[PDB]
């Protein structure tokens, strides 16, 4: 069939396609996300929408089970197969052990798959990073990100995509334990963190939450404008 090693070691020790193909992560949409103690909140930004056309087909926060949310960066085409394979994997886990899918298990699935997808013959490695957030069984919320290397890695909050150093540098000024003592402080915390992100005109900000027992709720552009209202009024109070 197709016998050729695409991804080989460079003489200075690096793999190229792993440590080069993160540029496709660097040139995609941004996505952030924090975890509250009770309700998590993640959201994609820099949507660059045509603003006269359809929007449900460009939805890039999805679910595997209701227990688990998605978020990713990079080119979405390669991410689709990772999502569907992850879903087929997390259903047979329900066919086995009768608890719902723990998030650390499914992150080891995407990470292990993406590793052996780098390792094998004649296969271009994936160019996506992704986030996997879900309040598990026994009510405990946590999050992980992926890597084209395939190294799952548990953060407290996110910055992936364009300017991950900008937002990831910004959330150190977030991490005061007051944030988040309230869930509205968590959501307006995410959107106020996406103020330093791209244009933030209330159009390209798509956020979604999960209240630890509920299915994930794609919020309409109704309270995003109100959180921009209390955020801008709070900046009016800042002087």
């Amino acid at each position: 069939s197709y016998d050729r090693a695409i991804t080989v070691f460079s003489p200075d020790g690096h793999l190229f396609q792993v440590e080069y193909a993160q540029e496709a992560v660097k040139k995609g949409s941004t996505a952030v996300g924090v975890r509250g103690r009770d309700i998590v909140v993640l959201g994609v930004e820099k949507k660059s929408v045509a603003k006269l056309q359809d929007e449900r087909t460009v939805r890039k926060i999805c679910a595997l089970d209701d227990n688990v949310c998605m978020a990713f960066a990079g080119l979405t085409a390669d991410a689709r197969i990772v999502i569907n394979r992850a879903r087929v994997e997390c259903q047979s886990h329900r066919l086995t052990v009768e608890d719902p899918v723990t998030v650390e298990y499914i992150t080891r699935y995407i990470a292990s798959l993406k590793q052996r997808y780098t390792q094998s013959n004649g296969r271009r490695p994936f160019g996506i990073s992704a986030l996997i957030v879900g309040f598990d069984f026994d009510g405990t919320p946590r999050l992980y990100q992926t890597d084209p290397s395939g190294t799952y890695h548990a953060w407290k909050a996110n910055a992936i995509g364009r300017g991950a150093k900008s937002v990831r540098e910004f959330l150190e000024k977030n991490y005061t334990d007051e944030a988040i003592e309230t869930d509205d402080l968590t959501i307006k915390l995410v959107i106020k963190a996406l103020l330093e992100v791209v244009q933030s005109g209330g159009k390209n900000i798509e956020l979604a939450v999960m209240r630890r027992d509920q299915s994930l709720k794609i919020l309409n552009p109704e309270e995003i404008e109100k959180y921009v209202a209390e955020i801008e009024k709070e900046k009016e109070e800042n002087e």
């Binding site: 090693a5 991804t7 080989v8 070691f9 690096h14 190294t151």
Partner: protein, 228 residues
């Protein structure tokens, strides 16, 4: 000039294995020490930012009950060898009803340290440290991408390897005890790390015939660092 992925050098050896050895040098460090009482072990997690949770990172996974491990370099390459090496230990136990010795594990991995090619892709980029106690006592082992497996009494790896070995033969002798060696590792770690040594940076791992198990919990390490 991308030539044969399996081609020898003018010196000469395998080009891609020699390139694979340099991939260990940018990975994080680790310290193993063989004791007459057991095997202590050390690593550094290398926290990248205060964003990250520090305790989800694994550099020590424990293969059987009685055989420890330490990985290095690219971790996602190491996880495959971990999960399959566990299967080889269990297959030993279910054909044989006895514990697989610490030696034969690394034959059972290093026999496929070299399987790359096109028919029949790249070699692995990890340098493992195996510990454990079989009937032959506490053994401390070390394998490379080349499969050249050897016993090492007190092995360092990674970026710190040169200064850690070089400083480490000075402070080692034949009759080391355990709690001497445990605080004898963190001196080297706080010399070789760039962040301040505290409760979130490193993790120890010990395995003994009579102190087991005795795995790896927090707040032991708080007492361990404060003895400096």
């Amino acid at each position: 000039y991308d030539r044969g992925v399996n081609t020898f050098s003018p010196e000469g050896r395998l080009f891609q294995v020699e390139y694979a050895i340099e991939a260990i040098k940018l990975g994080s460090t680790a310290i193993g020490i063989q004791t007459s009482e057991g095997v202590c072990l050390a690593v550094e997690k290398r926290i990248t930012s205060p964003l990250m949770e520090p305790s989800s990172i694994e550099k020590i996974v424990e293969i059987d009950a009685h055989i420890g491990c330490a990985m290095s370099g690219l971790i996602a390459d190491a996880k495959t060898l971990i999960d399959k090496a566990r299967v080889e230990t269990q297959n030993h136990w279910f054909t044989y009803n006895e514990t697989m010795t610490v030696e034969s594990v690394t034959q059972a991995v290093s026999n496929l340290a070299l399987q790359f090619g096109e028919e029949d892709s790249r070699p692995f980029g990890v340098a493992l440290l195996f510990g454990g106690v079989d009937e032959k006592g506490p053994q401390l082992f070390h394998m490379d991408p080349s499969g050249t497996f050897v016993q090492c009494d007190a092995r360092a790896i990674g970026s710190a390897s040169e200064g850690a070995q070089s400083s480490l033969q000075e402070v080692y002798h034949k009759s080391m005890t355990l709690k001497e060696a445990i605080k004898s590792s963190l001196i080297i770690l706080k010399q070789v790390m760039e962040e301040k040594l505290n409760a979130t940076n490193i993790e120890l791992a010990t395995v003994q015939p009579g102190q087991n198990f005795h795995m790896f919990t927090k707040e032991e390490l708080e007492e361990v660092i404060k003895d400096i």
